[PDB]
Amino acid sequence: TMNITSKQMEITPAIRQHVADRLAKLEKWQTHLINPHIILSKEPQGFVADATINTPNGVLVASGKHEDMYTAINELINKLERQLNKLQHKGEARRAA
Amino acid sequence: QVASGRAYIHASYNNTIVTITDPDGNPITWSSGGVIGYKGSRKGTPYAAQLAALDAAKKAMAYGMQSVDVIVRGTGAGREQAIRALQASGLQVKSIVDDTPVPHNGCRPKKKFR
Amino acid sequence: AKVKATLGEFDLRDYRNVEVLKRFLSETGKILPRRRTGLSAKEQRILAKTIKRARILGLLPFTEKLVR
Amino acid sequence: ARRRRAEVRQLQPDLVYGDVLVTAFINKIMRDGKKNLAARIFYDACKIIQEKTGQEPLKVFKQAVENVKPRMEVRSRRVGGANYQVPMEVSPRRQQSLALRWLVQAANQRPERRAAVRIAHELMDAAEGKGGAVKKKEDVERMAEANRAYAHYRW
RNA sequence: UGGGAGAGGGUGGUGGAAUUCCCGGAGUAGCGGUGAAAUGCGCAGAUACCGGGAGGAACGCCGAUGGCGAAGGCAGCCACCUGGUCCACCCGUGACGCUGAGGCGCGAAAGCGUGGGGAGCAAACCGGAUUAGAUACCCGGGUAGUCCACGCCCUAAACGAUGCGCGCUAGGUCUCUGGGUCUCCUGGGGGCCGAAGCUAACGCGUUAAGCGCGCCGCCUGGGGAGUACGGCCGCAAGGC
Ligand SMILES: [Mg+2]
Ligand SMILES: [Mg+2]
Ligand SMILES: [Mg+2]
Ligand SMILES: [Mg+2]
Ligand SMILES: [Mg+2]
Ligand SMILES: [Mg+2]
Ligand SMILES: [Mg+2]
Ligand SMILES: [Mg+2]
Ligand SMILES: [Mg+2]
Ligand SMILES: [Mg+2]
Ligand SMILES: [Mg+2]
Ligand SMILES: [Mg+2]
Ligand SMILES: [Mg+2]
Ligand SMILES: [Mg+2]
Ligand SMILES: [Mg+2]
Ligand SMILES: [Mg+2]
Ligand SMILES: [Mg+2]
Ligand SMILES: [Mg+2]
Ligand SMILES: [Mg+2]
Ligand SMILES: [Mg+2]
Ligand SMILES: [Mg+2]
Ligand SMILES: [Mg+2]
Ligand SMILES: [Mg+2]
Ligand SMILES: [Mg+2]
Ligand SMILES: [Mg+2]
Ligand SMILES: [Mg+2]
Ligand SMILES: [Mg+2]
Ligand SMILES: [Mg+2]
Ligand SMILES: [Mg+2]
Ligand SMILES: [Mg+2]
Ligand SMILES: [Mg+2]
Ligand SMILES: [Mg+2]
Ligand SMILES: [Mg+2]
Ligand SMILES: [Mg+2]
Ligand SMILES: [Mg+2]
Ligand SMILES: [Mg+2]
Ligand SMILES: [Mg+2]
Ligand SMILES: [Mg+2]
Ligand SMILES: [Mg+2]
Ligand SMILES: [Mg+2]
Ligand SMILES: [Mg+2]
């Protein structure tokens, strides 16, 4: 199941749940999101949201950076979406010749 | 019943059909990848053409067929293999003429062919 | 084995001379390339034109099946 | 692997028959590097196949090996958007291995209680074309025969 | 005045290959189609094969790094009408020249009007797949249209992204077409590689993007915008 780490930060069950809510955007692709891991951290210049997820066709590893934590969590999701979609459709790329 | 005839091999990228005619041109029997038992793209293979030419020639021989003229149409995979099989069949093969139809730039082809 | 050589003086504009002309056709009946007729540009054009007229007349084929 | 071919290891002949093959088959009986036990079971089996069938362990075993040798098999190769099962001839090295592996495996699916008995039996049944090991070969051989159409797709 | 090559243009005829449909025959369990399938077609007899017929459209080989045209473009074959262009002769005219704001004509395709025509193809549209979804790509269908006549539209990566004419500045090689004293030379065209030189570089280089004169058109930061308003054109779409 889904695990979130807050590194050198205190975050609420609210913020935690909001992460589950943004991550669910990945269920769109209808494949097994296996032991997804979200990490939240506050660098000098803004927050960082890292995630590492394995699916039947591979791994999603990506990282968001923004002055705003919520905005970084989103940028994380985009990077994850793009990778996941690249995983799911790259195989179709060469059915001919 | 007739001793000599014709064997037409229609060989396309999806299939091989072989029909055996009389000398005048009328069919006595025929076969194809479909009749020999395959569906789908397997019909288009050389092993498909092989069973088709055999099963075609075999049914003919039972009508007293003995010598054939081989006519070939198409540039499909299982073409050349189809010819092997007619030779190996127990049939004579007096000739092998390729009469694949080609236009002198006629009708516009479908899109997939441009 | 160039065709132009294996013949004596002949008319390139003579469309009724089937015996000369029919040598420039592939066994499939097609007009042969310059590399096999040994013709130059200028002459090869006169050839093709008179072969075509000839096929019109019935003297030459438009196509022939390939025997093996 | 990537650079040059692999070299088959030469096995040391077995001291009850001097036979390169009995060695290999012993090994495939061996769990946890306990070779002595692996010999015992094998040899015990031979005693059994001598007792229940008055003819040579060696002669018997060697048959049940020839009868489980797969001559053709399918190996997969994706072409386009389908994973085709391609028919392929099996090199004698692999033929042997498969035969040995299967014999042990089939035997270890048998219901008789002691390891020595099962081996003895699977070998008996396979020398006579019966049993899981031979059944594996046929399944494998039918599978390849069925897919005869894709033979020209072979590497 | 002699000659030349060429899918240059217009009209009228006219040949064979193929596809489709119809008719006849013969034959039966599938055909077709994809990466794999499915829709679809097929025992109410399809596919594949033979013979007959109908109709439209495009002209395989020749064919080319080919040719012709100012450009758009132009290709089976025949005849007629007709343009451009090159060569040789050095015969005639006597600067009659170059460019060209406006104007006029021509202008791929799509599109439009009126009337034909309609085999194949195919926007729209239906359906099958693919896919997370798939208003697509791939598959089965399919109407405009694609074709002809006549009249419109007037756009374009209408490109060599290179305005026209003249003169001058090494050559090497391939090629089309002339005329020679036909080894070879001399014109006109099409490519390549390069001297000098140019150029931000890339590259250009007697087919200049080199060195110069004449005339024309055009640019002056990106977006907003080829939009608005006005005017002119157009049946509309829309154009300037
Ligand atoms: Mg990191
Ligand atoms: Mg797996
Ligand atoms: Mg098929
Ligand atoms: Mg087994
Ligand atoms: Mg009929
Ligand atoms: Mg009936
Ligand atoms: Mg017919
Ligand atoms: Mg003079
Ligand atoms: Mg002028
Ligand atoms: Mg003007
Ligand atoms: Mg126009
Ligand atoms: Mg038009
Ligand atoms: Mg139109
Ligand atoms: Mg119209
Ligand atoms: Mg649809
Ligand atoms: Mg659907
Ligand atoms: Mg669709
Ligand atoms: Mg379609
Ligand atoms: Mg269609
Ligand atoms: Mg129709
Ligand atoms: Mg209309
Ligand atoms: Mg309309
Ligand atoms: Mg261009
Ligand atoms: Mg030009
Ligand atoms: Mg411009
Ligand atoms: Mg100008
Ligand atoms: Mg200028
Ligand atoms: Mg010359
Ligand atoms: Mg000359
Ligand atoms: Mg020109
Ligand atoms: Mg030149
Ligand atoms: Mg050219
Ligand atoms: Mg150059
Ligand atoms: Mg220099
Ligand atoms: Mg030069
Ligand atoms: Mg410059
Ligand atoms: Mg501005
Ligand atoms: Mg406007
Ligand atoms: Mg516009
Ligand atoms: Mg206005
Ligand atoms: Mg303009």
PDB file of C-alpha atoms in Angstrom, chain A:
ATOM      1  CA  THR A   1       0.000   0.000   0.000  1.00  0.00           C
ATOM      2  CA  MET A   2       0.923   3.677  -0.280  1.00  0.00           C
ATOM      3  CA  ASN A   3       3.607   5.133   2.078  1.00  0.00           C
ATOM      4  CA  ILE A   4       4.516   8.810   2.663  1.00  0.00           C
ATOM      5  CA  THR A   5       7.685  10.141   4.305  1.00  0.00           C
ATOM      6  CA  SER A   6       8.008  13.717   5.604  1.00  0.00           C
ATOM      7  CA  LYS A   7      11.717  14.473   5.931  1.00  0.00           C
ATOM      8  CA  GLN A   8      12.713  17.037   8.591  1.00  0.00           C
ATOM      9  CA  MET A   9       9.080  18.324   8.506  1.00  0.00           C
ATOM     10  CA  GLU A  10       5.809  17.975  10.370  1.00  0.00           C
ATOM     11  CA  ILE A  11       2.782  17.291   8.126  1.00  0.00           C
ATOM     12  CA  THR A  12      -0.868  16.715   8.934  1.00  0.00           C
ATOM     13  CA  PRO A  13      -3.074  13.665   8.081  1.00  0.00           C
ATOM     14  CA  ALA A  14      -4.844  16.187   5.881  1.00  0.00           C
ATOM     15  CA  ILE A  15      -1.729  16.918   3.802  1.00  0.00           C
ATOM     16  CA  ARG A  16      -0.984  13.208   3.772  1.00  0.00           C
ATOM     17  CA  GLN A  17      -4.439  12.406   2.394  1.00  0.00           C
ATOM     18  CA  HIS A  18      -4.140  15.218  -0.185  1.00  0.00           C
ATOM     19  CA  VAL A  19      -1.125  13.324  -1.555  1.00  0.00           C
ATOM     20  CA  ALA A  20      -3.191  10.165  -1.896  1.00  0.00           C
ATOM     21  CA  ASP A  21      -5.785  12.280  -3.713  1.00  0.00           C
ATOM     22  CA  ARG A  22      -3.245  13.718  -6.209  1.00  0.00           C
ATOM     23  CA  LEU A  23      -1.571  10.372  -6.758  1.00  0.00           C
ATOM     24  CA  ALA A  24      -4.847   8.724  -7.704  1.00  0.00           C
ATOM     25  CA  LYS A  25      -4.595  10.658 -10.955  1.00  0.00           C
ATOM     26  CA  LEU A  26      -2.317   7.778 -11.958  1.00  0.00           C
ATOM     27  CA  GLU A  27      -5.131   5.211 -11.655  1.00  0.00           C
ATOM     28  CA  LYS A  28      -6.400   6.628 -14.949  1.00  0.00           C
ATOM     29  CA  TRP A  29      -3.923   4.346 -16.792  1.00  0.00           C
ATOM     30  CA  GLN A  30      -5.457   1.237 -15.094  1.00  0.00           C
ATOM     31  CA  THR A  31      -2.334  -0.620 -14.047  1.00  0.00           C
ATOM     32  CA  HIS A  32      -1.010  -1.835 -10.677  1.00  0.00           C
ATOM     33  CA  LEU A  33       0.715   0.953  -8.702  1.00  0.00           C
ATOM     34  CA  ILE A  34       2.958  -1.177  -6.501  1.00  0.00           C
ATOM     35  CA  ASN A  35       4.235   0.112  -3.156  1.00  0.00           C
ATOM     36  CA  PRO A  36       4.305   3.783  -4.158  1.00  0.00           C
ATOM     37  CA  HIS A  37       6.488   5.977  -1.982  1.00  0.00           C
ATOM     38  CA  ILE A  38       6.141   9.739  -1.565  1.00  0.00           C
ATOM     39  CA  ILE A  39       8.830  11.849   0.065  1.00  0.00           C
ATOM     40  CA  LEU A  40       8.392  15.446   1.098  1.00  0.00           C
ATOM     41  CA  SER A  41      11.311  17.707   2.061  1.00  0.00           C
ATOM     42  CA  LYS A  42      12.057  21.429   2.460  1.00  0.00           C
ATOM     43  CA  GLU A  43      15.218  22.601   0.685  1.00  0.00           C
ATOM     44  CA  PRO A  44      16.428  26.219   1.074  1.00  0.00           C
ATOM     45  CA  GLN A  45      14.728  27.390  -2.178  1.00  0.00           C
ATOM     46  CA  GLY A  46      11.392  25.441  -1.863  1.00  0.00           C
ATOM     47  CA  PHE A  47       9.913  22.009  -1.154  1.00  0.00           C
ATOM     48  CA  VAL A  48      10.820  18.780  -2.852  1.00  0.00           C
ATOM     49  CA  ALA A  49       8.430  15.943  -3.605  1.00  0.00           C
ATOM     50  CA  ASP A  50      10.119  12.708  -4.675  1.00  0.00           C
ATOM     51  CA  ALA A  51       8.395   9.490  -5.538  1.00  0.00           C
ATOM     52  CA  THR A  52       9.390   5.965  -6.520  1.00  0.00           C
ATOM     53  CA  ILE A  53       6.709   3.540  -7.852  1.00  0.00           C
ATOM     54  CA  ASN A  54       6.852   0.113  -9.574  1.00  0.00           C
ATOM     55  CA  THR A  55       4.195  -0.969 -12.057  1.00  0.00           C
ATOM     56  CA  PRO A  56       4.011  -4.274 -13.997  1.00  0.00           C
ATOM     57  CA  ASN A  57       5.868  -2.587 -16.909  1.00  0.00           C
ATOM     58  CA  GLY A  58       8.469  -0.627 -14.893  1.00  0.00           C
ATOM     59  CA  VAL A  59       9.451   2.052 -12.417  1.00  0.00           C
ATOM     60  CA  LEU A  60       8.393   5.605 -11.983  1.00  0.00           C
ATOM     61  CA  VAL A  61      10.989   7.736 -10.336  1.00  0.00           C
ATOM     62  CA  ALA A  62      10.605  11.477 -10.330  1.00  0.00           C
ATOM     63  CA  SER A  63      10.981  14.726  -8.404  1.00  0.00           C
ATOM     64  CA  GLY A  64       9.177  18.084  -8.028  1.00  0.00           C
ATOM     65  CA  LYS A  65      10.664  21.425  -6.938  1.00  0.00           C
ATOM     66  CA  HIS A  66       8.742  24.608  -6.146  1.00  0.00           C
ATOM     67  CA  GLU A  67       8.481  27.482  -3.665  1.00  0.00           C
ATOM     68  CA  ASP A  68       5.026  26.028  -3.004  1.00  0.00           C
ATOM     69  CA  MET A  69       4.681  22.541  -1.564  1.00  0.00           C
ATOM     70  CA  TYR A  70       1.330  21.868  -3.257  1.00  0.00           C
ATOM     71  CA  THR A  71       2.646  23.075  -6.606  1.00  0.00           C
ATOM     72  CA  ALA A  72       5.694  20.785  -6.260  1.00  0.00           C
ATOM     73  CA  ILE A  73       3.475  17.814  -5.433  1.00  0.00           C
ATOM     74  CA  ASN A  74       1.602  18.575  -8.708  1.00  0.00           C
ATOM     75  CA  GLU A  75       4.784  18.923 -10.794  1.00  0.00           C
ATOM     76  CA  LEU A  76       5.741  15.605  -9.306  1.00  0.00           C
ATOM     77  CA  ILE A  77       2.497  14.146 -10.606  1.00  0.00           C
ATOM     78  CA  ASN A  78       3.068  15.473 -14.141  1.00  0.00           C
ATOM     79  CA  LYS A  79       6.484  13.920 -14.321  1.00  0.00           C
ATOM     80  CA  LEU A  80       4.959  10.680 -13.027  1.00  0.00           C
ATOM     81  CA  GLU A  81       2.068  10.776 -15.542  1.00  0.00           C
ATOM     82  CA  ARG A  82       4.402  11.327 -18.437  1.00  0.00           C
ATOM     83  CA  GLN A  83       6.614   8.507 -17.445  1.00  0.00           C
ATOM     84  CA  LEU A  84       3.711   6.158 -16.754  1.00  0.00           C
ATOM     85  CA  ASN A  85       2.123   6.957 -20.093  1.00  0.00           C
ATOM     86  CA  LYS A  86       5.455   6.434 -21.824  1.00  0.00           C
ATOM     87  CA  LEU A  87       5.595   3.060 -20.130  1.00  0.00           C
ATOM     88  CA  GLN A  88       2.147   2.055 -21.210  1.00  0.00           C
ATOM     89  CA  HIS A  89       2.375   3.000 -24.894  1.00  0.00           C
ATOM     90  CA  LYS A  90       6.084   2.676 -25.849  1.00  0.00           C
ATOM     91  CA  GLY A  91       5.486  -1.001 -26.526  1.00  0.00           C
ATOM     92  CA  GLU A  92       2.957  -0.189 -29.239  1.00  0.00           C
ATOM     93  CA  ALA A  93       5.550   1.845 -31.066  1.00  0.00           C
ATOM     94  CA  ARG A  94       6.671  -0.794 -33.484  1.00  0.00           C
ATOM     95  CA  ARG A  95       3.915  -3.214 -34.562  1.00  0.00           C
ATOM     96  CA  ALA A  96       5.014  -2.694 -38.221  1.00  0.00           C
ATOM     97  CA  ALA A  97       7.353  -3.659 -39.852  1.00  0.00           C
TER      98      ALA A  97
END
